[PDB]
Amino acid sequence: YQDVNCTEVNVFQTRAGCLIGAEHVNNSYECDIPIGAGICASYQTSQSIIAYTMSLGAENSVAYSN
Amino acid sequence: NSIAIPTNFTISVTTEILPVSMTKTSVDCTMYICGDSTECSNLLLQYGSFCTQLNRALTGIAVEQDKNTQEVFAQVKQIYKTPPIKDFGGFNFSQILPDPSKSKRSFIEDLLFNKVTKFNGLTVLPPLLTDEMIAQYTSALLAGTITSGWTFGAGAALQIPFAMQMAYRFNGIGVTQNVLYENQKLIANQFNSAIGKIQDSLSSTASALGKLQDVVNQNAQALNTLVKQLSSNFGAISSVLNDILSRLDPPEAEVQIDRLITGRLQSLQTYVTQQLIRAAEIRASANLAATKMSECVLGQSKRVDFCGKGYHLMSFPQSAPHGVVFLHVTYVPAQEKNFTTAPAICHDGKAHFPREGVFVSNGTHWFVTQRNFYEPQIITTDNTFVSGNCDVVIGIVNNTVYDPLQPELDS
Amino acid sequence: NGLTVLPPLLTDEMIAQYTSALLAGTITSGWTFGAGAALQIPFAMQMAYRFNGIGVTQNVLYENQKLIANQFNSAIGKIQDSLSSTASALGKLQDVVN
Amino acid sequence: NSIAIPTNFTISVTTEILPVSMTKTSVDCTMYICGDSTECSNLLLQYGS
Amino acid sequence: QSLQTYVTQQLIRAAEIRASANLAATKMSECVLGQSKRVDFCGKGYHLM
Amino acid sequence: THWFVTQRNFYEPQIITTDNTFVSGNCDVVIGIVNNTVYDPLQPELDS
Ligand SMILES: *[C@@H]1O[C@H](CO)[C@@H](O[C@@H]2O[C@H](CO)[C@@H](O[C@@H]3O[C@H](CO)[C@@H](O)[C@H](O)[C@@H]3O)[C@H](O)[C@H]2NC(C)=O)[C@H](O)[C@H]1NC(C)=O
Numbered sequence: 001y002q003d004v005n006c007t008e009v010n011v012f013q014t015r016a017g018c019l020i021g022a023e024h025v026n027n028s029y030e031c032d033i034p035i036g037a038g039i040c041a042s043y044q045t046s047q048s049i050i051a052y053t054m055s056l057g058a059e060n061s062v063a064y065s066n
Numbered sequence: 067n068s069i070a071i072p073t074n075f076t077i078s079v080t081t082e083i084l085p086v087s088m089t090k091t092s093v094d095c096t097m098y099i100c101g102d103s104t105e106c107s108n109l110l111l112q113y114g115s116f117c118t119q120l121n122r123a124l125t126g127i128a129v130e131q132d133k134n135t136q137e138v139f140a141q142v143k144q145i146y147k148t149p150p151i152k153d154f155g156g157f158n159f160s161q162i163l164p165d166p167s168k169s170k171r172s173f174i175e176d177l178l179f180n181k182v183t184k185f186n187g188l189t190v191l192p193p194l195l196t197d198e199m200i201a202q203y204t205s206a207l208l209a210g211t212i213t214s215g216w217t218f219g220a221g222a223a224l225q226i227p228f229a230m231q232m233a234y235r236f237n238g239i240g241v242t243q244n245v246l247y248e249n250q251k252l253i254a255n256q257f258n259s260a261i262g263k264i265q266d267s268l269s270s271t272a273s274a275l276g277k278l279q280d281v282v283n284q285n286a287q288a289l290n291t292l293v294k295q296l297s298s299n300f301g302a303i304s305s306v307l308n309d310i311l312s313r314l315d316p317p318e319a320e321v322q323i324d325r326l327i328t329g330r331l332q333s334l335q336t337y338v339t340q341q342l343i344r345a346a347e348i349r350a351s352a353n354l355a356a357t358k359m360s361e362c363v364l365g366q367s368k369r370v371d372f373c374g375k376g377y378h379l380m381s382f383p384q385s386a387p388h389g390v391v392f393l394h395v396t397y398v399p400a401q402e403k404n405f406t407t408a409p410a411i412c413h414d415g416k417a418h419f420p421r422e423g424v425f426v427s428n429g430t431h432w433f434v435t436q437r438n439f440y441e442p443q444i445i446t447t448d449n450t451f452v453s454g455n456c457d458v459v460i461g462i463v464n465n466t467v468y469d470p471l472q473p474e475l476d477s
Numbered sequence: 478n479g480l481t482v483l484p485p486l487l488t489d490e491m492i493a494q495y496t497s498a499l500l501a502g503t504i505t506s507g508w509t510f511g512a513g514a515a516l517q518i519p520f521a522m523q524m525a526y527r528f529n530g531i532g533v534t535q536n537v538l539y540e541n542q543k544l545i546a547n548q549f550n551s552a553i554g555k556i557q558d559s560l561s562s563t564a565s566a567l568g569k570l571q572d573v574v575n
Numbered sequence: 576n577s578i579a580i581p582t583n584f585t586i587s588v589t590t591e592i593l594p595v596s597m598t599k600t601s602v603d604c605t606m607y608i609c610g611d612s613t614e615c616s617n618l619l620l621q622y623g624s
Numbered sequence: 625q626s627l628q629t630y631v632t633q634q635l636i637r638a639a640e641i642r643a644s645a646n647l648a649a650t651k652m653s654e655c656v657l658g659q660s661k662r663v664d665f666c667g668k669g670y671h672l673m
Numbered sequence: 674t675h676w677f678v679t680q681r682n683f684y685e686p687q688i689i690t691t692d693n694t695f696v697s698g699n700c701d702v703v704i705g706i707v708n709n710t711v712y713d714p715l716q717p718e719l720d721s
Pocket residue numbers: 073074075252401
């Protein structure tokens with residue numbers, strides 16, 4: 001439900017709106033299905049739809065030196 | 067037979083500002099037209115597919131604004147992060163890199179974020195990327211651009227010392243590498259100082275960000291106009307549906323609601339038409355910005371006045387609301403001397419020509435120099451090539467070209 | 478009937494000044510007037526430093542400078558003839574006006 | 576193992592033409608719709624912005 | 625409704641003239657103020673000026 | 674009858690030398706190599 005607060009309707013309030021049926025996750029990944037405001041969802045581990053904050057790929061500290 | 071050659075240059079940090087994406091906006095066209103009036107909502111069925119088509123059009127714009135934003139910024143596979151030690155040979159990026167004390171925006175991205183600036187079915191959707199994720203991408207692009215040059219565009223990023231990367235950008239404008247390392251102190255000071263002046267240019271006045279503020283203003287103007295149009299009478303007895311529904315019998319209330327449906331729908335069509343056209347402009351600006359990312363940031367363009375007004379060295383992106391700012395680092399010449407010149411020079415009855423550069427003298431003894439920074443060298447068989455008999459070249463002049471093998475008369 | 482046309486900001490005389498300036502830069506100074514400061518350079522030498530920019534060595538220009546000049550001037554002649562001979566060239570501009 | 580290498584060239588001046596501006600146009604929307612009729616001018620206001 | 629249609633036609637046309645003007649400005653910046661190495665951007669051939 | 678190097682846009686045949694050519698690797702790996710006699714511009718000077 002875009003823009004609403006979940007009171008007004010598992011459940012997870014997001015910056016994009018009230019999301020229902022998706023499990024929140026604290027890991028992060030490439031965006032599989034986009035939702036909004038950095039949130040993305042995937043079908044994942046017995047398996048269910050999860051939702052997570054997008055990772056913009058993996059980080060890399062480039063081994064720069066003078 | 068006269069040439070002016072620059073003896074000196076300035077680095078410059080010409081700024082360029084491009085919009086990249088409108089506010090993602092959608093209208094429940096039935097709530098806009100009818101405000102939950104069941105009589106109105108039913109009359110709107112008689113008009114058929116327009117309401118569905120307008121939402122398809124606005125949704126096309128809305129998805130496309132994330133795409134536009136993704137095409138500009140997502141030009142990298144990995145989020146590169148800068149080393150802890152800022153050993154960049156004097157170049158002081160501390161204004162353009164993330165300030166971690168906060169959202170990991172840089173200092174200059176904060177100036178840009180500071181300087182910029184109902185619900186009748188009207189809704190604004192959030193962007194897919196948060197402005198913090200955009201600041202991660204502009205940090206990645208920048209951290210690659212600092213640590214690894216163009217190479218992070220061409221697949222795998224490779225470390226290289228920043229002064230060496232600059233020498234291999236100087237060579238990309240025909241200025242020989244030694245004209246960087248022999249001036250490294252002075253080039254560092256010029257670049258650092260120029261970055262300094264950008265902060266004043268952005269802090270002093272709002273008029274620099276005019277392009278982005280026009281896009282914000284035009285959307286707010288169009289939305290305010292679209293909402294005000296609901297109060298427009300369109301030849302009804304009133305612009306409030308409850309008046310019509312209470313004051314009139316159903317057949318007359320319907321004919322009056324039809325005037326309002328017509329006026330409101332014609333307004334909504336007008337608005338969506340403006341937004342499709344405006345979004346086409348923003349798409350063209352985003353594809354341009356995406357290209358300046360791909361050429362100037364991820365590369366070094368040899369397109370004159372594409373990557374800012376000078377000989378181009380490199381560029382840095384900085385995120386801004388609905389837009390992007392490029393800091394195009396450009397070489398520009400700045401002091402020059404007149405010299406007498408000749409297309410070729412003649413020696414031992416044959417024409418000689420410079421391999422690279424131009425021939426010059428200040429009216430006395432002949433020197434070759436590269437053609438973007440005066441660096442007179444003794445003319446030799448090795449900085450030159452022969453091209454047959456002396457005669458046919460218009461305006462050739464004489465010299466004794468030096469033979470570097472001449473001292474070697476031992477065997 | 479309530480329709481109006483406004484004049485362009487730049488007069489056609491100012492447009493002809495700009496095209497003359499652009500051209501006078503292009504002639505006297507190569508690319509240099511785009512890259513900030515316009516520097517004189519002799520035109521034969523500028524053309525050698527445009528042949529060198531298409532992988533053709535400078536000597537091929539100076540050893541042919543008269544032949545090249547004649548082909549260039551002759552081609553400019555064919556422009557005046559071609560443009561005088563037919564309106565079909567300026568199709569785009571007349572189409573925009575129409 | 577065969578290559579063709581040019582022994583000679585031509586300069587060739589090719590024309591290109593591009594439009595740059597439409598004719599700057601403006602319409603008095605009220606004078607166009609209503610032709611100075613005061614009775615019309617008052618009805619046009621109902622259509623709003 | 626004819627006026628809205630006319631303004632719409634002119635907007636869409638003005639966007640084509642803008643696209644053509646940016647291209648003209650780019651040919652000014654590369655073909656006049658420089659030497660574009662973009663094959664068949666500045667006329668059909670290797671490009672001088 | 675004669676092998677020459679030339680610039681690739683205008684036939685300007687030059688005698689092949691250490692100066693207009695660079696060496697790489699060994700004779701065996703290149704599919705298309707031919708024989709030749711590359712001239713050494715120091716050889717007439719070594720005759721001194
Ligand atoms: C090429 O242009 C640059 C920039 O115009 C010249 O660089 C430096 O310019 C300053 C004045 O703008 C020179 O003055 C001195 O600056 C120091 C502080 O850095 C100050 O303590 C002194 O009292 C004085 O004002 C500075 O000497 C000069 N740098 C160098 C390397 O001499 C540069 O000189 C120009 N190069 C040529 C060959 O024209």
